[PDB]
Nucleic acid binder design. Sequence first.
RNA 1: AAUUUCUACUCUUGUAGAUGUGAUAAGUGGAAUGCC
DNA 2: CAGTACGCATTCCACTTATCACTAAAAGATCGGA
DNA 3: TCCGATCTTTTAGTGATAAGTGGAATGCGTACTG
Length: 1302
Amino acid sequence: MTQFEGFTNLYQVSKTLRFELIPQGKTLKHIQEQGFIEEDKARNDHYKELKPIIDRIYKTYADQCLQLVQLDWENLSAAIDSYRKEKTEETRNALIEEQATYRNAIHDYFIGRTDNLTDAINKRHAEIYKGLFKAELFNGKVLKQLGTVTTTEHENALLRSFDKFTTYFSGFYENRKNVFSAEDISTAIPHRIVQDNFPKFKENCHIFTRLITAVPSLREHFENVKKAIGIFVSTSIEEVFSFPFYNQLLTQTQIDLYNQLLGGISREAGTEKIKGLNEVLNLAIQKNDETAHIIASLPHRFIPLFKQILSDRNTLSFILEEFKSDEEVIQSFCKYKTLLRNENVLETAEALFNELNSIDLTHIFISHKKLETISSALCDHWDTLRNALYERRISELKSAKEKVQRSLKHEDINLQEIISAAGKELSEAFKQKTSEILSHAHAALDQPLPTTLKKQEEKEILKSQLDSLLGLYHLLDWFAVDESNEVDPEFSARLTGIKLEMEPSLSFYNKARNYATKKPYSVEKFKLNFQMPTLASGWDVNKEKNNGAILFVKNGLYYLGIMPKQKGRYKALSFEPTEKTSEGFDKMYYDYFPDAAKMIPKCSTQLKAVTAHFQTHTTPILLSNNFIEPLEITKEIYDLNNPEKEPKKFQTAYAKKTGDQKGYREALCKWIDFTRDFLSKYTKTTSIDLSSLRPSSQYKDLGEYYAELNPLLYHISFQRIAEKEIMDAVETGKLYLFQIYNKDFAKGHHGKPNLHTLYWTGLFSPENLAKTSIKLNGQAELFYRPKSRMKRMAHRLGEKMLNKKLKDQKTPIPDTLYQELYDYVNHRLSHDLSDEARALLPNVITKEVSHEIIKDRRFTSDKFFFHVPITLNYQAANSPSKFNQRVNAYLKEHPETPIIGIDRGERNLIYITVIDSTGKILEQRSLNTIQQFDYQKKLDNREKERVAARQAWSVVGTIKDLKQGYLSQVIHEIVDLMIHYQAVVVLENLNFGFKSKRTGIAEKAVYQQFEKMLIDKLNCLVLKDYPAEKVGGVLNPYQLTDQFTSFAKMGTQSGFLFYVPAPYTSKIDPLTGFVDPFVWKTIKNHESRKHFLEGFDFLHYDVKTGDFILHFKMNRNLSFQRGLPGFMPAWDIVFEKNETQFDAKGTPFIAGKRIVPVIENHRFTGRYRDLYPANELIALLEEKGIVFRDGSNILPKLLENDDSHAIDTMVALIRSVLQMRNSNAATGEDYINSPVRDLNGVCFDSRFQNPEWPMDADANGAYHIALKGQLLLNHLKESKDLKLQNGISNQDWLAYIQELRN
RNA sequence: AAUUUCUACUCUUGUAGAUGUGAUAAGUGGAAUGCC
DNA sequence: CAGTACGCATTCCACTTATCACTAAAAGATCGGA
DNA sequence: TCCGATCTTTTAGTGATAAGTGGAATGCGTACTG
């Protein structure tokens, strides 16, 4: 019993706004005179340079701590494989209990608490650990206390440059405190050694011992490869793969050497490489004997261990030298090409090429390890010469025939044999290839060195000469080097000499690649402080003196006030509040007590005076300072807050562990009375009303009281300050005044503002001031982005200037036409305009230039910036309580809820389908365009441009610009329909590796980041045209999805967003629910093809309408079926005639026209093909003599012809009909056609173009996920648990859709 | 083609939508190169 | 003539997940001056 | 030798929180070997 608008004020969210600061008057001049920006720039560079040093200290303490680790690992392995075998809830509780046990066990080594270690060094560890997270990292207290890392005088001076400024590193201190924490944190060291590395090592032990008891001879090879690599020499190989050896491999170097033994070591380029541990398994697979088969029947991957958290890698492989300037690499190439030009390489290279003609090619052999690129370069395909040689040595001779292919991949072959095998044309192809390679080499020698690298053409020409040099280097490597065969010794010696003269060119190409691909020089923003250690960290009236940040409101314009530390002192600059009738600024008066749970013992119970008084005697203590009346602290509350143990007496964890409900209730009541007493007596909160809080005994949970009490301590008021004081303060430099500014506050602001402007206005609304639904937070930052230097081009006066759109706003203009039309309208045509330029010229609109628009204006000049965090929906708790249960209760009470569906892909990025509760579709359309220009046509061009420029050593760029520029308006469209229909959105749930890989091939990362933007909008949702007081406004925003924290915590349902299982969601008939149960992997041979033939029931041609009736039952072809059938016991396949009808609008189309790509070879090559199955079968039956006009059974006439051609052709036709996808990227004709006639009496073709059915394949997929949402809703309807089912089964979904369609 | 910032624009010295910042750590995917 | 899967390593680029802060007051260093 | 103002540097800590199975989910690259 609830409403849709009731899903608000359930949990609070926090957001950060951004603004530009503009100085007013002489504040900029005083900032320039004080030199705060250069000091802050040098300070930022010193912090960036100095961060590695504190990092070194932390690394050193880390590995010095974990060198003495001594503990068992059996119990965690027992918990892990018990959870693997059982997957039961109590096993999971035992697993997480032991995981926390081991995490705190290693954490005791950092603390110094563990009983196995001696007391002196763990006391030292305790002192050092107390020393890490305080300011003694700068005076060298813990540095010399450790006393193991050297620090030169430059390092000491850099460390001394941050005197009285160690609070700058407070974020660094927290970012290391979470590294050394032990609360399951993903960047914590115990979490890494317990969760991220130990299960991998445990399963590694398991696969090693299973492989060893499978093949006992492989331990010999493992020990020899360990001895050849010479690591872990004190240990035997099965002792490495055992649990007690995980007492090592916790520091960085041991994990790196283990991973090195996994992956092997390489020298520099052109030499050998010692095989790793998995390389010998891959070679055993390559051996292809029965041991290979018994190895492959087991698994054979040893997963390398993850790198430790704060450490740095150290490899034994060769690390190439990296250039650090353009001058060094360009001069080293200058001397390298000088060596080229004075050694006279071209004469001897040409002579070496002419020895191919002077001497017979039987004395010239080839390198068989890389003959494949030779076949690619000379012939059209890489396999042609290898096949031709194989058949050629067959012809001069089945085991004897296969001896030719057995022998050909381990010996060098003369070029004359290749010429005899594949023809004479390879001789002239070889000589023209040498001619063109020497042509590129001569062009490289003719092309002079450049002067710089900034222009792209210089990188292009250096790249081109580098490809010439490397191509010559490989051309030397076609021929074999050794003289074991019958090559000419002079030929081999000459090629060897000329190839070790060209050996450093490959390494040169590698280093030029390493330097030229790096990012260009750019300048970004940095934090500003004005020599203030705690600038803008809080706006409170007590703390604004040393924080130094206050705001003003001046007739709708918001200002920032930064009063600096004048002359090294905090001048008490105060303003008297004048009356509101007097003109001037409105200074904000923040009044905040941060957290009730946090500082109610920090100001009353955990002071040093009270704890010093309390450890001697039990007499209560009276506290007078910062208390209007004295407050009494007794022993019966001090023992509660300090119970010398993890569970406090008033905490719910004590009642969970013990169960003493009465004692827990009494302790909670006493603590609650004490808290109320503190808020009564304390000087900050004595003037705050507490009458709205419930009595003591009513409460059931302490955190509930803290969540209720926290909003009461926050308050804003406002007072009026005369502007004479502000103007005089800015004039004398006592106050720096910056205006909070975006272009919504500009002069010509007409329409709707930005959204952040709307929260910024709604923060300071009087309705929000009376009751704070959203709240302003602290730690504001000031940034200074300097003057980024670009050349300026802009539309000047007296010019005519072109609009991007046409007269009709629907049709844009392509950029290639746009630049030519722009050159025309400015009368600067560098080329003659084309024919479509004539066609589209009189249909375009132009404008005269006005207001001097400049491109990249915001980056033209140096600008201040200001980032401010705010907290929304503040009256609710910090975390929701059974959000999904409330959503499912609402859906149980509202069975008439519509469902919308979103899909993701490449051809169609998104698609919209809206259904009702009964499956009738409301609305469906495309948003590949948003009625603006179709973003796909530019987005794929941007993708291919990045792909082309990444290999061309150009700038790389980003894809997120066009990505989120599509996705913002897309997100707007889905939220608009979502609120308009009050519907439930569904998105498909996919495996993480799937989305990662598909981001790998295609640069469309929307399978995860669409979900991210949809979640981070659907949790805090405001609408610009909604009134503020109504739900959906800025003070009561729409909370529809659960508060996401991580994908591990994220589940099958997050409020109104439903994830459905991925399989069988796209290629299903909506008319009756048809899919093909077979796979084509099982049918490989011919008797299996005959079995697939006989799996059908009967095959009959109805001569009345021309369709061919084929029928199947699932109790046949069980092996070919994947074990997942449809529910309907019968499936007639209407093999219809290719008869041509018209669509809804009347365009002609052929029914049953099933387009398939014609592959030229097996390797999925070739173009598309307009192929019609029914004419093919009637041609096949006429060719085979099979009578079809009889109308009787025809499958006996198919199976009486036992030739493989007939059964192969009808199985191919069955595959070409049973498919569901009919796409054509060349012409844009993609559609879906169903083979099974419905009970209405029609076969579904997507060219029906009727509104009640999907228009496309992705339309059909969105329709299916809408009905999986409907199926989950039905499962909710007959469930009383108010929870879900853990996904849904694929066969259960298919049974559901077969029941409901037919 | 003007933006806290991005995206698409120009009836409009601006328009429509979106926008949690900072720091730190780990992991992943591509390009080139050798190597097995 | 296709069928069935494919190991590693160094440089660069981009990206993606996960964690912390959402602070005023207590505590301590300190500096002039007495 | 000592004191109080002043500036910089820690600190304090609540309840809430898994849960589970299957192979497509969407476009398709070489290369040794089936």
